[PDB]
């Protein structure tokens, strides 16, 4: 149905995302159990890690476009990523390595993330009808890898330990690289312009030096999340001032702020919603016991089922508004489940969490899947950078928000933890409802500006 290079990009993306989500699904638990962080520390540290992973994406796009070439930057990113995963596995021998290893994952993603999608864009002549389907399938590839990793990585870490889990993340990256190398010939006429000139070693060294520096800067910021907050606040004011100086930008700015709220809520799945599942949900569904950390796999699960369907079925501000209403309902459902539908021992049916994750995933499909693609319609590289920066700020804020659900390690009674989760989730859902209403009220004006 699709050009041959589509299938290579599909499976490279799948395996890279498998590696990443293998880490994300277990990271907060790893912080608490293996490193002895409190739940607050683990949550803010995860926020900083995720912020760095997403905030640097603009650099790897620049490197792929103008310095080394898309295909070269896929290879370099994949190698740095595999090194990071193996460094994380080694961090169990040498714990002092952990932050450096995570910085290496962050920088790796920053080099890698933009480039397979960029490559995929080039596999179709520019007005090929198959493009839309190709990107829906690309997103499904991302979410199949995420589904497998979030299902299995907690089981693997429980049964064999974290070093094996992280080494398997690295192996997933290695097999992404092997699939690329084996299929290299399929993309021989595909790439950005530097891909087809001989590689500039001057530029290659500038990229390796900048990467190493960035690895150390990321490790430092994740260890010191207070200065990370400071840095991002300063960066945001500066970028907003530059943006305002340079009426479709006003619409791009407002849609970006709404996306910020969405990413704050997305950041709860690996942190507060994960520990909500651990502490206050039954670990049995359809008669099968499961690792409660695996409940995170409900996000890609619902995306995989809903993206074809939802591809089959207003315009921008209203789609964004709908997504915000879905997210509101996800957190109100979590709160309601805890307030009214819990056991006398304090436990809720896991079907409430299946529904929470459905709501959250529909929100994802409406906001972030369909976001900077159509922020690019109001504007270009600068706004791309701003989107990633604001999403990094959102993950830092999300980690901070998650700390309101942190439970001390000596609490053992689910009836003590249930009211904390319900209070926080109910207030998140109400604030998000308010945001959705203000979005709705602005839809006519916003939609006017696009005219």
């Amino acid at each position, epitope marked *: 149905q699709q050009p041959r290079p589509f299938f290579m990009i599909f499976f490279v993306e799948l395996w890279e995302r498998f590696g990443y989500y293998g880490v994300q699904g277990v990271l907060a638990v790893f912080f608490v*159990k293996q490193l002895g962080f409190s739940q607050e520390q683990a949550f803010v540290t995860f926020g900083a890690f995720a912020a760095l992973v997403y905030g640097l994406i603009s650099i790897g796009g620049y490197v792929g476009d103008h310095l080394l070439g898309t295909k070269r930057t896929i290879v370099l990113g994949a190698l740095v990523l595999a090194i990071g995963y193996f460094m994380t596995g080694m961090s169990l021998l040498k714990p002092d390595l952990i932050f450096i290893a995570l910085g290496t994952i962050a920088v790796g993603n920053g080099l890698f993330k933009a480039n397979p999608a960029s490559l995929l864009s080039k596999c179709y002549p520019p007005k090929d009808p198959r493009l839309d389907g190709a990107f829906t399938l690309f997103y499904m590839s991302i979410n199949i890898g995420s589904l497998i990793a979030l299902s299995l990585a907690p089981v693997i870490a429980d049964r064999f330990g974290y070093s094996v889990t992280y080494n398997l993340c690295g192996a997933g990256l290695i097999i992404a690289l092997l699939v690329y190398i084996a299929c290299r010939g399929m993309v021989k006429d595909i790439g950005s312009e530097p891909d087809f000139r001989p590689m500039s070693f001057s530029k290659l060294l500038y990229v390796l030096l900048g990467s190493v520096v960035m690895i150390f800067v990321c490790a430092w910021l994740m260890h010191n999340v207070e200065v990370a907050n400071l840095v991002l606040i300063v960066l945001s004011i500066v970028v907003t001032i530059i943006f305002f100086r340079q009426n479709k930008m006003f619409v791009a700015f407002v849609l970006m702020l709404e996306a910020v709220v969405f990413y704050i809520l997305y950041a709860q799945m690996p942190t507060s919603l994960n520990f909500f599942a651990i502490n206050n949900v039954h670990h049995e569904i359809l008669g099968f016991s499961i690792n409660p950390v695996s409940f995170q796999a409900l996000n890609p699960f619902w995306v995989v089922l809903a993206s074809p369907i939802l591809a089959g079925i207003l315009s921008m501000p209203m789609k964004f508004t709908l997504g915000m209403f879905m997210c509101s309902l996800g957190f109100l459902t979590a709160a309601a489940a805890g307030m009214w539908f819990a056991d006398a021992q*304090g*436990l809720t049916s896991p079907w409430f969490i299946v529904l929470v994750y459905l709501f959250q995933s529909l929100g994802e499909l409406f906001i972030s899947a369909l976001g900077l693609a159509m922020i690019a319609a109001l504007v270009m590289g600068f706004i791309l950078g701003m989107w990633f920066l604001t999403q990094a700020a959102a993950f830092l804020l999300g980690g901070y928000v998650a700390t309101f659900t942190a*439970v001390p390690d000596n609490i053992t009674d689910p009836l003590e933890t249930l009211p904390v989760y319900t209070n926080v989730f109910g207030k998140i859902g109400l604030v998000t409802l308010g945001v959705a209403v203000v979005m709705l009220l602005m839809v006519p004006w916003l939609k006017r500006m696009i005219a």
Partner: nanobody
Framework: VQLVESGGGLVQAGGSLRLSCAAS????????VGWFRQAPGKEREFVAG???????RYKDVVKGRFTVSRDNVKDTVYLQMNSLKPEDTAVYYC?????????????????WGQGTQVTVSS
């Protein structure tokens, strides 16, 4: 996923016994381990437990007599039963739930040992 209990037996009032729980596959370190007991003609009831991060929970009628503790090297959990009384006579079970919570009812736990008889004679 499967827990082996050991260490039951027969003891006179005021004596002591130690139960131990070990898991074949999953590292027990990630699990809250609760000890339940079923006396003749009654339901399983929570006795005592330790979560994955050394938090402890006890039934009122056993405080000051039973201690739950954990050897994370041997991947083992212990219930030390001192000042035993006839009414501590029961089948004892260890049960394991992932995480930090020790819920009171058997349905909060997915993994169960087979049970060891503890008898305390007057």
């Amino acid at each position: 996923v499967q827990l082996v209990e050991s260490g039951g037996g027969l003891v006179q009032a005021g004596g002591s016994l130690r139960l131990s729980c070990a898991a074949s596959g999953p590292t027990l370190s990630n699990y809250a381990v609760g000890w339940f007991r079923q006396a003749p003609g009654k339901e399983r009831e929570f006795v005592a437990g330790i979560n994955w991060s050394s938090g402890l929970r006890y039934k009122d009628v056993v405080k000051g007599r039973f201690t739950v503790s954990r050897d994370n090297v041997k991947d083992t959990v212990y219930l030390q039963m001192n000042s035993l009384k006839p009414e501590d006579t029961a089948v004892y079970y260890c049960a394991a739930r992932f995480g930090g919570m020790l819920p009171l009812q058997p349905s909060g736990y997915a993994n169960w040992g087979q049970g060891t008889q503890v008898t305390v004679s007057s």
